[PDB]
């Protein structure tokens, strides 16, 4: 099945999922000279107060930090979205080394990760409706870079020892994903898709220009997850990036001058 390995990985994906190759996949490089301000978008709202986190799953590819979505409790507006969209789940994706690890680069630059907080709109009734509409999704993108630590990331570091392999979960409530923020919502927005197979077309990006810093030895505990089950042979799960995608016909906007 689909990967990150030299068989399975990104350049394969097409095979099983035709839609690799489509008009608007994702990620992108964001050429910031070409981007353009777009006064008429408004400012985000991440409206993450109420946020009801459960559990944190190593699903094979990344972990997944899951939220209850039964009601409008975490939720993002605004911007370039029209309605109310439910945070499900966060997750991150890394490098092998602290130059790789972002699936958007920014003037073809990588950093060493990327959050992608994972809303759906509420007027599709469900996560898996939602994936089958233009606008059924916005992802909120956040660099990583190695630098300071990031305080609020460090209860997920903690506890990636209790889920190093696949289809491992731990219990993971009363997490406040606003500790994961940088101080600036400014942002880049574009069409695009998910970014992990079956590759749907429904994604309103939002990807946030200020990255947030981690420390060198929280990137390194992402680092010693595993892609396989227990008991199967350790493949340490790094490189969990899919590359930059043809742009085509789209037109980046940006929150700021
Ligand atoms: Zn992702």
Same mark, same amino acid.
């Given at each position: 099945?689909?990967?990150?390995?030299?068989?399975?990985?990104?350049?394969?994906?097409?095979?099983?999922?035709?839609?690799?190759? *489509?008009?608007?996949?994702?990620? #992108?490089?964001?050429?910031?000279?070409? =981007?353009?301000?777009?006064?008429? $978008? /408004?400012?985000? %709202?991440?409206?993450?107060?109420?946020?009801?986190?459960?559990?944190?799953?190593?699903?094979?590819?990344?972990?997944?930090?899951?939220?209850?979505?039964?009601?409008?409790?975490?939720?993002?507006?605004?911007?370039?979205?029209?309605?109310?969209?439910?945070?499900?789940?966060?997750?991150?994706?890394?490098?092998?080394?602290?130059?790789?690890?972002?699936?958007?680069?920014?003037?073809?630059?990588?950093?060493?990760?990327?959050?992608?907080?994972?809303?759906?709109?509420?007027?599709? *009734?469900?996560?898996?409706?939602? #994936?089958?509409?233009?606008?059924?999704? =916005?992802?909120?993108?956040?660099? $990583? /870079?190695?630098? %300071?630590?990031?305080?609020?990331?460090?209860?997920?570091?903690?506890?990636?020892?209790?889920?190093?392999?696949?289809?491992?979960?731990?219990?993971?409530?009363?997490?406040?994903?606003?500790?994961?923020?940088?101080?600036?919502?400014?942002?880049?927005?574009?069409?695009?898709?998910?970014?992990?197979?079956?590759?749907?077309?429904?994604?309103?990006?939002?990807?946030?220009?200020?990255?947030?810093?981690?420390?060198?030895?929280?990137?390194?505990?992402?680092?010693?997850?595993?892609?396989?089950?227990?008991?199967?042979?350790?493949?340490?799960?790094?490189?969990?990036?899919?590359?930059?995608?043809? $742009? /085509?016909?789209?037109?980046?906007?940006?929150?700021?001058?």
């Amino acid at each position: 099945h689909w990967g990150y390995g030299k068989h399975n990985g990104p350049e394969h994906w097409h095979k099983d999922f035709p839609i690799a190759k *489509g008009e608007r996949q994702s990620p #992108v490089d964001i050429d910031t000279h070409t =981007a353009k301000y777009d006064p008429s $978008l /408004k400012p985000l %709202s991440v409206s993450y107060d109420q946020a009801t986190s459960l559990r944190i799953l190593n699903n094979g590819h990344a972990f997944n930090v899951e939220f209850d979505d039964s009601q409008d409790k975490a939720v993002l507006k605004g911007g370039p979205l029209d309605g109310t969209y439910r945070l499900i789940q966060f997750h991150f994706h890394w490098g092998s080394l602290d130059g790789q690890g972002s699936e958007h680069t920014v003037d073809k630059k990588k950093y060493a990760a990327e959050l992608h907080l994972v809303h759906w709109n509420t007027k599709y *009734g469900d996560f898996g409706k939602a #994936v089958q509409q233009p606008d059924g999704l =916005a992802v909120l993108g956040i660099f $990583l /870079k190695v630098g %300071s630590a990031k305080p609020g990331l460090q209860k997920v570091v903690d506890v990636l020892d209790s889920i190093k392999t696949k289809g491992k979960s731990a219990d993971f409530t009363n997490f406040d994903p606003r500790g994961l923020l940088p101080e600036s919502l400014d942002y880049w927005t574009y069409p695009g898709s998910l970014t992990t197979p079956p590759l749907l077309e429904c994604v309103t990006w939002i990807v946030l220009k200020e990255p947030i810093s981690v420390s060198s030895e929280q990137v390194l505990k992402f680092r010693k997850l595993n892609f396989n089950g227990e008991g199967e042979p350790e493949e340490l799960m790094v490189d969990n990036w899919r590359p930059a995608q043809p $742009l /085509k016909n789209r037109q980046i906007k940006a929150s700021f001058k």
